[model samples]
Target: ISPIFQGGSYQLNNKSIDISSLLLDKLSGESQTVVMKFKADKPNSLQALFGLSNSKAGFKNNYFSIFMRDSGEIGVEIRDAQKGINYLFSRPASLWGKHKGQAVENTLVFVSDSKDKTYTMYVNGIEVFSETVDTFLPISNINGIDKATLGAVNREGKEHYLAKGSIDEISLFNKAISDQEVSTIPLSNPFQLIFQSGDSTQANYFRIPTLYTLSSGRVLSSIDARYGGTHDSKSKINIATSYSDDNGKTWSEPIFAMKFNDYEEQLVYWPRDNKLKNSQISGSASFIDSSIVEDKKSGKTILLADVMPAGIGNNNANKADSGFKEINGHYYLKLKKNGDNDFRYTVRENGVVYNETTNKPTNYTINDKYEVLEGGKSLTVEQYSVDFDSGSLRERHNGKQVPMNVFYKDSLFKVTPTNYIAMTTSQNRGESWEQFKLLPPFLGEKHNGTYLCPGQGLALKSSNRLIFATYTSGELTYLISDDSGQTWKKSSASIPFKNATAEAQMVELRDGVIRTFFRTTTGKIAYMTSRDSGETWSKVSYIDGIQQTSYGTQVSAIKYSQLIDGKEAVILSTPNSRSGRKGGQLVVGLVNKEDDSIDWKYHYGIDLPSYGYAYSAITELPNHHIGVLFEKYDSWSRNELHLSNVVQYIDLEINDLT
Candidate 1:
């Protein structure tokens, strides 16, 4: 879709273009394909490149459009006023703006088929995705495509999304073109946005991606959808998951694998100074910092996230209480009324809430979905929905409402103010998920302020053990399940430096040999090894090549199946800068079986030091490539970045590791 169409030019300067000038003639056929070569001043913004509008007076009333979104999405819209249909289809981007501080030329091909009633999209000659909508749309069907606009929308709404760039060349084919033909056109391929801030109305920021490749060869990418801003656990957030069939080349729409729906999405930042002050940040139900593992025996994917109660962060959580009270050798989740001095209620043998003082059941019960139930019917509560210029929640019309949850501030029953890990499972390779199950105490009955070390977990092939790291403050521990999560036990091996240890990930070099990589207080990549699985013993040491900000950013490590340079391989991803989390690098190493250590050697950089790259997760693709999802932001800058911050996905081929 490059080098300009051989015929007439339809170069556009502003928001749009004329259909005739764009196509060199009128697009009168119902089945047609439009291809445009263009650019954007800003990357990952909500801006229209081309659109067909049917309007009266000043703005278009009905329309069809193809555009880029602030959520790092490519979207198509269909607004039919007569039919009262407002439909939109969007996917995370494979082509975004600015590579190396220069505009990246883009090519977009949209094909419409009247017979199939389908719209297919391709960015940079790569067939992205396609969907057959309820109603087919074309200039022939809409009757106002001759007035199509470029670079922006000319419709009644969606005007805020503007394309501040130029259209170098645009062409329209009267006949629908095949994806094979589109692939022949010249273009450039860039890293795709798998998850991003403002990807939906529900999330404003995203962080801590946990990437895993299932046995079926599909990639499961999960992250923290930070709604209250990117201030970590003290903000409202949820765990979102997306799947990709082509490694990191493309991704499906996100789903909340572990959702804490107590609070609706809202900005907790101050616009006056472009910053998120401590005074503005407030805790809502934030289930964040996810880690994942696929059970070898059952093939079910288990996802773990740090579950934070309303108004609770790890530092402020009640250190003495684990949110679970043990009675008769059993530990159960406890709750209290708003004014109670202690947690005097329990989610007992069944799901019903019990009055601990009276030892009797109460009317309310909590279910796996985290919903409060009465008479088997879910309770409903008011949502702080709809926003005004002053950012106040409005309760007009039907009245804002959401399901009453254990973490909701207004609920009759309140969860203990502490941190715990939440788990959910997916049997179908992340197409959907099971309900939430709180992490049973793997550290006895005193597991308070514990969270999963963000990244992928490990499955020991020698036994049916599932293993991953859990952390409380700087103390590191292992949560191991020998029977695939039925019961968990803490690792008996003592770590050499518990105070400096932070979030970590593990990889099985072979059989029962395990290697661990982690974030440390010294701003270096640290490691430990175990020869007999979790009954491990190895002194902690720092990797020589990889370095990070002194504040420390989470890193990921994994065992690679194929040998690198004829040596047993392991890969680790970590940020390379000491200033902030940026210039992330992929480090490859050869495993020394004799010493149970890795010879850290090769390094491959992701972006420039100024570009964003933070906490990341990695897994091997079926083609021996590496799939990575990482936080794309300059952590050194504490100012509010507004909405463009995101979780970026990149697929690096086998040769690129060098």
Candidate 2:
């Protein structure tokens, strides 16, 4: 009723083409095919394009249609009395935006073969997607109310997905088309540069962003500003912080919450001939991998990170120096008493370093050179220095060719001790940060010098205690604090699952059971539960229904909302595939309070396949909105290392997810 082919094209502006008369008695018990070529006026909304339906109109009603989503994804949907199926295929937005949304003409063809019981879809004459359904089923007549419509159909009583463009050609054939004939239409390129390199401060590479909503309704984001090209252990990295006060509409400039001036203001100094140039020159002891969480009781913020010393990393960092010793079930950094065989000790008590021999606080703080300073003087600590068997000679700290006793070894560079846990607090909800404080490496018995990686800390409402996850060797243990954060004791139990690396987060269920989810090497999210607060935990189990890369990738989950099913639910964020960190999905599931398990039901893709998403953190925002701070790039492949290492912010709604 809308048009009768004006100049061989249906000119539509919020109008549709009706082919009801052509389908009078044609699609009763045979196969059918629908084809159309159209150009959209804009991309701000979903265009229903066209479909065959038993209902009067609209896609959501029982219909099979092809749609161009508002997000510029090509989609197909099939619905019957028994069930419904939807398939969305990603296409680059660059090609879709070429000609002001009409960049290139798009041709869509759909075939439903009753004989084969299959549905095939083609975009631009190529088979982009396909699905199978009931073969015995025939085209619906719906009491002779069969209708074939193009461009903007009615849903229920409202006209949604109305097209804002023109439909050039639309044809219906009461027969199946061969696959060879469908590959005749040409396809077009699709893209955004939202997170650009060097867009902010001096950091050349930004990676591993952790985002959390503060108690004061502001969102805080933290990232590693890798100054020397994004290398983890070898780069001069700093913990950069930013905030969004207006629900993430805008962000403040990059503010470094924790940074190091190890060698000349943390400069990337690659000496001309590889000589140890400065006394402060040590290993690549940089602050990286930051995780942040807010204390629900005190309304304060706590930030945690692994502080690696010069040239020390996780694999080789646990090598203890001669000064390393344990005192009264605690670890201490000791030094040999000048002339005696006994070593003088320095212990960290409740976040402050103290000298046990003097029975007083020590001013031996980590200096701008990353070295321990004693009363405005650099201590003569053991530093791993190289004479560079081939380069020009330089002045040594000991006024000799060698800085320390030469260890005649068979390696590239000599090693020394450096890795430790560091933490800081934000009393004013992330407006400013206090000085960094180092945590003693004495939570549990040492395992041959294994270092700890910080995970998101949780402040439980039941006990009002701080429970944080620390990874050591192959085990994950909770560091518990009862009197706020002044002192932390190790959990009686430890999670020693195989190949457990990176960090994890905790969420409490309605049944008062605490569940912790962490990264595993099993290509799936793994979790453990503790019924007795942080003291004990169940054996590790893999979470079903979600798959990830075999190598560990960081994920985040939080309590979303109370579901209508009288159960509490949680929202999760992670990449949905194990292929290459491409499919970023938002999942919503119900917490099975009865079994202390979780049931994942709803899944939504956040990014296209062409782009990449990695290491995501989730937080509930002021409204029913959820925010995810993630590293947006193809981090799995080394090609994209320096191209687009960025911490991005994304927002969604509970309504949209559920």
**lDDT agreement with native, every candidate:** 0.70, 0.59
User: C-alpha displacement of 508 in model 1, angstroms?
Assistant: 0.8
Best-performing candidate as measured by lDDT: 1
Candidate 2: regions farther than 4 A off: 1-201, 264-283, 319-324, 335-418, 443-455, 492-496, 564-566
Clashes of 2: 12
* lDDT, candidate 1, 542-602, per-residue tens: 8887778776888888889998877899888888878776677788899776765678778
Candidate 2, lDDT over the whole model:
0.59
Question: Which lDDT tens digits does candidate 2 get at residues 322-405?
Answer: 224576766655433234445454535432345567778756444322234446554443322333335542312332221121
**What TM-score would candidate 2 get against the native?**
0.60
Taking all chains together, each candidate's TM-score versus the true structure is 0.70, 0.60
Worst 10-residue lDDT window, candidate 2 = 403-412
Candidate 1 Cα errors over 4 Å, as ranges: 1-189, 196-201, 265-272, 275-283, 375-377, 386-388, 391-398, 444-447, 492-501, 640-645
